[PDB]
């Protein structure tokens, strides 16, 4: 069956360039164009260009001419995309696509039935940074709320558990938000009985794999 194996996402700074590969399989690679499309959250999808693997003929969208390059390796059915002179506008999820109608006699390019898993590309002048984990201590119906504030980390994602996962009831971890500094920050709260603030111990396990930082932040009443 038709499978578009894409290379993973990556982290970039403005001015650098990026390279993405997409391995085709399950069909004759020369029969039909391969397209590249980027999707930025809250923005109109952008077709970048197609490549016809036979001669490597390309058609690049006006917007990208000069900056983009599309090549392929016929001997291994792999397609390649390079995007140069990156800015923060190039932050999107880049896909490779192939239409549905694909035979040796004819094709229709634009009914994209087959997509790659995606490759999230983020372009920011922010460097990788471990998060600072600050307590949200409770005070004094009969329930108290406490939590972790996970501030100033780059990039996504960060993971939060409570009491090493032994506490999952009444837990709300919020979608992280992008501060004007460029760093991320999220809060994770949990509701507990008031008759436990002095007995049961509450620890917020924050793990941020990119910077390789783990924090076991104990939240206790001030």
């Amino acid at each position: 069956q038709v499978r578009l194996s894409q290379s993973g996402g990556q982290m970039k700074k403005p001015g650098e360039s990026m390279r993405l590969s997409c391995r085709a399989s399950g069909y004759e690679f020369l029969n039909c164009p391969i397209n590249w499309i980027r999707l930025a959250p809250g923005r109109r999808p952008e077709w970048m260009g197609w490549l016809k693997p036979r001669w490597g003929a390309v058609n690049y969208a006006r917007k990208f001419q000069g900056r983009v390059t599309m090549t392929r390796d016929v001997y291994s059915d792999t397609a390649f995309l390079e995007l140069r002179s990156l800015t923060s506008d190039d932050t999107a999820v880049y896909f490779c696509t192939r239409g549905k109608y694909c035979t040796a006699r004819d094709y229709y390019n634009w009914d994209f039935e087959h997509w790659g898993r995606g490759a999230p590309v983020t372009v920011s002048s922010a460097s990788t940074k471990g998060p600072s984990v600050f307590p949200l201590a409770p005070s004094s119906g009969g329930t108290a709320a406490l939590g972790c504030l996970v501030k100033d980390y780059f990039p996504e994602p960060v993971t939060v558990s409570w009491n090493s996962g032994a506490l999952t009831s009444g837990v709300h971890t919020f979608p992280a938000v992008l501060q004007s500094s460029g760093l991320y920050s999220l809060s994770s709260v949990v509701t507990v009985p008031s008759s436990s603030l002095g007995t049961q111990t509450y620890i917020c396990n924050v793990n941020h794999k990119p910077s390789n930082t783990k924090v076991d932040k104990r939240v206790e009443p001030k």
Partner: protein
């Protein structure tokens, strides 16, 4: 009475036994003689739909030409995958001859005699033939060589003009010679001469024609954006040698000086990419002595820049990389139908 159908066609030609040229021999082994007195019967009050982009004749011609090259243009080594199959690499006397395509019993070819017919849609001057006109299987990119000309005006052909994925074939109504030479005594460097005035007048006419299918939008030509040399350059065959020509000067937007003789840098390659499918092929070093091919430029293969949001421009670039389109540029006016 009749209905559209796909059958197995047979070929006819004027190949002679005394001619030892490769394509000629191929035709003595594969074809019957050309019908001495061809009868073309006209159909009255008949309108039929043609579709050059859906025509099995193209497929058959493709298989034939693949066979022809298989027995004539035999490369020294073929690099597949994978393996590297070596073989014999003789001198090649190759010069394409007209081949007629003919229908077996029970079938018949319908032909469109409409002058400005673009290849798809209804035709109202239909006639019946038993054979196509002579068609030289000339394999080339960007430029269509030694083909037939449009009988009236320049014609733009495309499965759908707004689909940038679709090739655009420009059919000229007046040809322009291209004179390619490789001197005697670097034995790979060659050149191609074209009369600037003629070519520019023609190009002017195709831009002014293209402008009609784009609601008075400014039309701009540009060099290819990428791809193998076979497609980024004018690629063709002459005297068994494989030529590649830089066609930048051919698509100069300003020249509409620039009216003398346009001279193109060319190169003769021994390592080429096979148009048949996947794989590179190596050929023996070029023969000695002056090599010269004079061809008629009859058509142009274009590709329109997509994503052209806004603007008052439309950009076109030469080639065009699917040889089946070379065949379509000739077979556009025919379709096979079954009787009863």
């Amino acid at each position: 009475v009749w209905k559209d159908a796909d059958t197995t066609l047979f070929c006819a030609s004027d190949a002679k036994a005394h001619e030892t040229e490769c394509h000629n021999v191929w035709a003595t082994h594969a074809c019957v003689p050309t019908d001495p007195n061809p009868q073309e019967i006209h159909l009255e009050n008949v309108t039929e739909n043609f579709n050059m982009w859906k025509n099995n004749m193209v497929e058959q011609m493709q298989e034939d030409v693949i066979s022809l090259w298989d027995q004539c243009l035999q490369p020294c080594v073929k690099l597949t995958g994978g393996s590297v199959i070596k073989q014999a690499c003789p001198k090649i006397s190759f010069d394409p001859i007209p081949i007629h395509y003919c229908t077996p019993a029970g079938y018949v070819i319908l032909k469109c005699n409409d002058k400005n017919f673009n290849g798809t849609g209804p035709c109202k001057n239909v006639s019946s033939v038993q054979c196509t006109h002579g068609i030289k299987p000339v394999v080339s990119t960007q430029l269509l060589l030694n083909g037939s000309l449009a009988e009236e005006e320049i014609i733009i052909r495309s499965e759908n003009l707004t689909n940038n994925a679709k090739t655009i074939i420009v059919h000229l109504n007046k040809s322009v010679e291209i004179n390619c030479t490789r001197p005697s005594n670097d034995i790979r460097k060659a050149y191609c001469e074209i009369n600037g005035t003629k070519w520019n007048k023609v190009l002017k006419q195709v831009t002014e024609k293209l402008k009609e299918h784009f609601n008075n939008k400014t039309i701009i030509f540009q060099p290819p954006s990428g791809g193998d040399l076979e497609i980024t350059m004018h690629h063709f065959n002459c005297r068994g040698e494989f030529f590649y020509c830089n066609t930048t000067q051919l698509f100069n937007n300003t020249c509409i000086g620039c009216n003398g003789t346009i001279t193109l840098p060319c190169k003769i390659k021994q390592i080429i990419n096979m148009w048949q499918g996947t794989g590179q092929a190596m050929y023996a070093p070029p023969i000695d002595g002056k090599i010269n091919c004079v061809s008629n430029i009859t058509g142009i293969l274009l590709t329109r820049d997509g994503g052209a949001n806004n603007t008052s421009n439309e950009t076109f670039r030469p080639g065009g990389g699917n040889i089946k389109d070379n065949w379509r540029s000739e077979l556009y006016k025919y379709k096979v139908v079954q009787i009863e």
